[PDB]
Design a binder for this molecule. Structure first.
Ligand SMILES: O=C1CO[C@H](CO)C=C1O
Ligand SMILES: O=C1CO[C@H](CO)C=C1O
Ligand SMILES: O=C1CO[C@H](CO)C=C1O
Ligand SMILES: O=C1CO[C@H](CO)C=C1O
Ligand SMILES: [Mg+2]
Ligand SMILES: [Mg+2]
Ligand SMILES: [Zn+2]
Ligand SMILES: [Zn+2]
Ligand SMILES: [Zn+2]
Ligand SMILES: [Zn+2]
Ligand SMILES: [Zn+2]
Ligand SMILES: [Zn+2]
Lengths: 881, 881
């Protein structure tokens, strides 16, 4: 339902210091699979250096991968290669390369016997130098694609020259269809028909038949050139043409007009929601062609109108600019394509024209797009695929544009940008993990990080309602943001950031899978390990932890060790904890990736051997709300104590254990909040802005340390938030859509947002349900995860019912998307009276009474908070829509 | 005084995808200057490819630099080059290259007519291919250095073969001194004397005469090889030898022992505080040689003892490992050298053996060292210099170790690591700036970031007591951490993070320079600009801001635009601020670089045209302590209002201006805190953990917006801290070293830390100043910047006098390096009685009385806090030492 945010990108330098650069392609070794494909990259070479067509091997294809290196394999070595594509010609499950070469060095140096089109035979294993067989020749051959254009039982290739001879920008060239013979393995010329003639075709794009949802039997050909952008397709019996548009208008003395490039973008069920374009040849102009809303799906049945989106600046003496290609891909996984624009770079340099721009369709109705910079290093061509994982995330690969006589990007290279919801950076001894918001990602991301105590601690982000397969009764989880859910014989089991104060949850997932809630989830997954020991842990050498980060995280992170250090030896000990078998392991900041850089939670680990107290403390030093999750309980008796006396009354240095209560925290459990809270759940704060705690500590089970057995536990340090209430109030309400009514079996009125106006600070009222009145306004009432409170949000606008500052007797009420922190004036405790009427109470402020949502009288009645009159605060809830 | 922390490093990839790799050198073009020198890098080549000796041009040499590219210049092209150095042979101010080539491909393939030693003549401008003249030949020539070894009036070169012929690891080779002739510009052989014979010399290091503080007239030669590490030097009349040590002991069947490498490390005034070493040839062993404390400075006068520091793992079938070089450099600028260890990499791969380890001398007395990973990409050789700035920061450059027949690091390259106290990362629309702690850096760092409103906003970190030259009466400053100071006709002027509540400081520096205090400083410097307009700013096009980040920050940051956006259009507007000339510019997180990743301050900007109110608000939404600094006041009347009535009494939507007070904030001023504070300065907190503010707003001066004039101001959002007191108490105390005494002209006792024990929680007492008693303990009393409070810290240990939790009547007192946040129980308000006796009062807690530092009676008297008896809380301060 909610707008999708962009993922994060982890850059990896695939191959650097290239001699030249021009083409890059996502190359699946097999035609059955599209997982972790390889990359093919090259440049045109020169008259001295034949160009190496390099098939760079994808590290993350080999399972349990350690390498970040892309092993280059020379597929072939060729005089001026230009364009390429692939398909399974031998029809054996292996992808063959099809490539144009013998082009020449420029549109001014065209080889008259050249423009060779050849295919390279995939031997089914990674050897170099593949067998080459010629398909055909046509001078100036400059782009091609494989597919099924007039038949399905055989590979066909469409191939087009940009010009027919040196310096000739006026003669149109032949749109050529080559057909595989029955035994392509005999050297012989491939059958050819010419299917049209065009001026300066600079790009060929294809729409596979399968994508058209039964509209076409064959692939459509989309040409961008001086004639503009058009669609060429075969119906079984004939070729036909449909003009999409004419592209840049000509200007005298400039031989370049029309289009340089074009792609077809999916929007929902329509494989062609729009067509984007770059203009003209190597131009600086981005435009999009649209079709009236309610148009038929596809290309040929709609008339298209051109809208210019940006001009990235003027052109030079050669009449060129900085745009070489556009492509479409679904970058944020919301089911509509974004488009990428390959910025070659400029002379003099200009970041605006270097790298990749990603344009998002923000408004499907008005066809408005907005742009974001994805990368700022030269992009001469762009390829998309998922280069690292099984899901439908989309990574971007690029190659610097460096071509003698056009533009030569300094330090030319191939890079890939790995889409991910988790990015890792070394700080010093601890790692910074930046995470996307779960609510707005459409992608699951897992990143393993530490192998310790029989477990692989894995950071996982889940999108709303996503599913996670686990190992029943073995896999453990700990929620840091959001909620996750599972079902067994007993019903639903939900995990939030913190369970009920002083409580104790099992982390073990007893089902075959879990699912995240409405807001998605961010959690630590405890995967069973065999590489980090088995309890009971009798010594600290047994608990040596191993770096788990995957090969695409940066090297300085992969190189990190996380040792256990005796607490006495940490720089914060100051002579404390001498002689204690008490150890610490740091550490991991999990923080939001967005512009807030807000903390999610800091995470670190501890151990204690038999009889060891971790020392009573109270967190006056630094502010946070801590939850612990024990991995191994040395004795089955270790756990948390807190003092039950006031603080003056307890001596942390010589503790009177009887003034404490113990909560055993068993293998793979987590405990509830121990800090002091106000009754609706807000945390008590000390005078120096720290969360207020009673004296507390982790104590290992007593006994003799022989044989030894270590407690091992993880610490989750959250910033302040509202938790559960004291006492826990009864459940008297279902989340749902409702009309909220006041009055009796005689004359009633309903809760309303004045004129349904979305503006922050719009008043909330009771509108008399009149004779021929408006119908009652719908409110979404919902439960606040990890609390006993509810929020009321306007069904149409989203606006939360909220008391104006400050919440006092007789205070007005309004709508807002700008709640106070911890929703102080926009959350509610519910009671149900014996009649069935609902009351909504504010968090009770320090020195004032309870304040309830209320009418002020008996043509709108205004809505205040007050607490003197029961009668004015009783509401009836009618399910609404 | 305080231990120096390491700086940060910004990596830059100097030259990637190299064919091979071996040597890197910091190469100053002129011998007069060492600023922003160039880099020389190469490998040995092969029998096919002569090796390019590349002089890579340093971008940051050209002033106001835009480029991050290192322009390669082929100096020469040579059969198997190995070692090199430089000096001014032509004696013209230009640095000439001296290089050994014609080596062969390996110790098994030594050219019998090779080992050529040649110099390359610096034409005084960056042309390629320099003139080459042969100095001499000796087969297997493998290392050399230039310097003055037997004379000063002429360049001399020491040159040494590692072996004399193919596969011969037993024949020792000649230590050769070459001397420049008087006219080196005539091709002729250079005069040679042999000065010794050694086995497997793998490194030559040099100590310039000038570094020895008059100990030597000539340079010392330090050789590492199978004979170990030794020193060879000339006294004017003879050569002499001093054995430092024998290095790795031989093990049978392994031809490698002794040392592979060695460097000489400064410690304070001693240019040779230690000698570090790597063992043996291409070995895996790091050791250090030490001299007894109280030894004479230098090398030849002390006996040296070897201590093995690490073994990084076993050796292979060739008997080699991963260490190629050690060097010394002063990395953290504290006046003692660290040493770097060049890790070649390993087969199979191992991060432990790849990159650079940096070892720090942590304990000068016991010669203990500890290590940190600085980089994890192959380092075959390491060069140090300051590649980017004028100060004495030290950058590290490296080249991958890739040599056919030894080890070939995949994807070989040259990288440099730029030392800096500020690192920049793009988040999304805002930049993350990570900063070092000022207290522990020895380096000034400036990084310009935004050119706006006639100013270049520059982030600056200053070490303690550092000096900053500025433009008198033009330069403006705003302190974010620490303090800075200046002097004019009126005395000292100090700037802290926030001035007195409701006050108004000028930011203009009226002196020629400022200085940071004891804790250093982190500040924004407002440099005058001509590239961002001139007030009055009549339209927002006038205030277009420009990205200022320097060329070594990453590209994705350099490519960022920071537009002004109308507040109505921001995603947090929710229909507010329609029709207001009210704009916003985001944005910059300044956060601590260390493992805490703690916030320093978030920074963003605003404008308002005539008559515009920025809207009354109270910060219930998000917690922070805000200070604003106006850059331009549209009218000279713009500024901050707050309400002076309680919050219930003020309507932010229809404000009654008379219930407010205004503080005009003139051009280049900043205002004091507007939030509510407890009387000793701790901030009032609301129930949802937000800093408590009265209704407040920025209002532009009234009038007609024609002609228009914009207020422009910057917002500093700090996390909570203690500010000044209400009312401001009188100054009755000087910071200083003191004995703290109780009693009368009859029998007295002084404040003491029990047994001067540094442990957290040691008791504080009053020890009767006895007959033959201990002397009175010294306390450092000091003023807490930005507050009216004092801290008492034990002069010997550092321990703060601090009341145990909770601060109540009769609470004990102790020492701690672990204060409560905002020093709640370890800071003090001072009063002076008419006698001259001092009282120390705690911050007054919500519901308890004042509590004073006190004795409990009239053989130690314990020290409590209490507040019933004046008499028990009066102290005498005697200046102590
Ligand atoms: O992008 C290129 C590269 O150069 C060739 C030569 O004309 C044509 C293009 O379109
Ligand atoms: O969370 C904490 C806090 O620090 C103690 C050590 O005193 C132990 C923990 O588990
Ligand atoms: O590091 C190297 C490289 O290889 C030569 C050839 O023996 C010698 C060394 O010391
Ligand atoms: O600091 C603030 C807070 O936000 C307002 C806009 O209401 C303006 C500022 O300067
Ligand atoms: Mg095939
Ligand atoms: Mg010279
Ligand atoms: Zn092109
Ligand atoms: Zn999308
Ligand atoms: Zn705790
Ligand atoms: Zn070597
Ligand atoms: Zn140092
Ligand atoms: Zn404010």
């Amino acid at each position: 339902e909610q707008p999708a945010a962009l993922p994060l990108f982890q850059p990896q330098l695939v191959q650097g210091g290239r001699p030249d650069g021009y083409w890059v392609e996502a190359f699946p070794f097999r035609s059955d699979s599209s997982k972790c494909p390889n990359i093919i990259g090259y440049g045109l070479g020169t008259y001295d250096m034949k160009s190496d067509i390099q098939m760079l091997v994808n590290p993350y294809a080999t399972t349990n991968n350690q390498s970040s290196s892309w092993t280059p394999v020379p597929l072939a070595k060729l005089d001026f290669p230009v364009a390429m594509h692939y398909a399974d010609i031998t029809k054996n499950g292996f992808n063959d390369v099809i490539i144009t070469d013998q082009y020449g060095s420029s549109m001014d140096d065209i080889w008259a016997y050249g423009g060779r089109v050849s295919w390279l035979e995939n031997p089914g294993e990674l050897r170099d130098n593949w067998t080459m067989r010629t398909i055909g020749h046509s001078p100036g051959m400059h782009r091609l694609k494989a597919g099924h254009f007039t038949r399905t039982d055989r590979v066909q290739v469409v191939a087009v020259p940009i010009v027919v001879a040196s310096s000739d920008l006026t003669t149109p060239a032949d749109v050529i269809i080559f057909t595989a013979p029955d035994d392509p393995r005999s050297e012989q010329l491939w059958q050819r028909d010419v299917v049209g003639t065009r001026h300066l075709v600079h790009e060929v794009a294809i729409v596979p038949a399968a994508e058209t949802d039964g509209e076409m039997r064959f692939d459509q050909i989309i040409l961008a050139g001086r004639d503009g952008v058009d669609c060429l397709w075969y119906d079984g019996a004939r070729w036909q043409r449909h003009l999409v548009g004419t592209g840049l208008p000509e200007e005298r003395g400039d031989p370049y007009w029309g289009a340089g490039s074009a792609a077809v973008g999916r929007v929902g069920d329509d494989y062609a929601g729009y067509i984007c374009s770059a203009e003209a040849f190597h131009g600086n102009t981005v435009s999009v062609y649209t079709k009236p809303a309610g148009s038929p799906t596809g290309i040929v049945r709609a008339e298209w109108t051109r809208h210019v989106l940006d001009v990235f600046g003027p052109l030079n003496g050669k009449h060129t600019g900085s745009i070489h290609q556009v492509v479409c891909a679904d970058i944020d996984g919301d089911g509509e394509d974004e488009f990428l624009v390959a910025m070659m770079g400029a002379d003099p340099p200009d970041f605006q024209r270097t790298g990749v721009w990603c344009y998002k369709l923000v408004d499907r109705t008005n066809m408005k797009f907005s742009k974001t910079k994805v990368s700022s290093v030269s992009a001469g061509r762009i390829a998309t695929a998922n280069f690292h994982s099984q899901g439908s995330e989309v990574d971007i690969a690029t190659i610097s544009y460096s071509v003698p006589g056009y533009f030569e990007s300094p330090n030319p290279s191939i890079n890939v940008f790995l889409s991910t919801g988790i990015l890792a950076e070394r700080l010093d001894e601890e790692v910074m993990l930046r995470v996307v918001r779960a609510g707005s990602t459409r992608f699951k991301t897992e990143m393993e990080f530490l192998d310790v105590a029989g477990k692989k601690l894995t950071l996982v982000v889940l999108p709303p309602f996503a599913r996670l397969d686990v190992e029943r009764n073995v896999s453990g989880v700990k929620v840091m943001a959001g909620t996750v859910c599972w079902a067994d014989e007993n019903g639903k089991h939900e995990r939030v950031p913190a369970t009920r104060p002083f409580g104790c949850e099992s982390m073990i997932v007893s089902a075959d899978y879990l699912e995240s809630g409405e807001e998605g989830a961010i959690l630590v997954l405890y995967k069973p390990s065999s590489t980090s020991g088995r309890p009971p842990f009798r010594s600290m050498d047994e608990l040596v932890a191993h770096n788990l980060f995957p090969a695409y995280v940066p090297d300085s992170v992969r190189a990190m060790k996380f040792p256990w250090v005796r607490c006495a030896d940490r720089p914060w000990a100051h002579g404390r904890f001498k002689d204690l078998d008490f150890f610490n392991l740091i550490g991991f900041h999990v923080n939001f990736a967005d512009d807030s850089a807000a903390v999610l939670a800091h995470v670190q680990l501890w151990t204690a051997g038999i009889g060891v107290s971790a020392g009573f403390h109270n967190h006056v030093e630094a502010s946070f709300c801590e939850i612990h999750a024990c991995i191994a309980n040395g004795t089955g008796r270790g756990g948390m104590r807190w003092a039950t006396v006031p603080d003056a009354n307890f001596n942390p240095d010589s503790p009177n254990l009887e003034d404490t209560e113990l909560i055993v925290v068993p293998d793979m459990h987590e405990h509830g909040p121990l800090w002091r809270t106000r009754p609706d759940g807000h945390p008590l704060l000390r005078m120096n802005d720290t969360i207020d705690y009673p004296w507390h500590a982790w104590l290992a089970g007593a006994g003799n340390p022989s044989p030894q057995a270590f407690d091992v536990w993880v610490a989750f340090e959250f910033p302040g938030f509202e938790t559960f209430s004291t006492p826990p109030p009864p459940r008297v309400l279902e989340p749902g859509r409702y009309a909220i009514r006041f009055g009796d079996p005689h004359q009633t009125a309903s809760l309303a947002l004045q004129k349904n106006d979305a503006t922050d600070g719009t008043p909330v009222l009771a509108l008399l349900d009149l004779d021929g009145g408006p119908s009652p306004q719908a409110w979404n009432i919902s439960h606040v995860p990890g609390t006993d409170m509810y929020e009321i949000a306007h069904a149409k606008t989203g606006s939360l019912v909220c008391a104006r500052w400050p919440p006092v007797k007789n205070q007005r009420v309004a709508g807002t998307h700008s709640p106070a922190a911890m929703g102080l004036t926009s959350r509610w405790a519910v009671t149900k009276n014996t009649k069935g009427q609902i009351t909504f109470r504010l968090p009770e402020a320090p020195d004032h009474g309870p304040l309830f949502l209320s009418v002020s009288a008996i043509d709108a009645i205004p809505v205040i908070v007050q607490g003197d009159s029961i009668e004015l605060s009783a509401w009836s809830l009618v399910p609404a829509n």
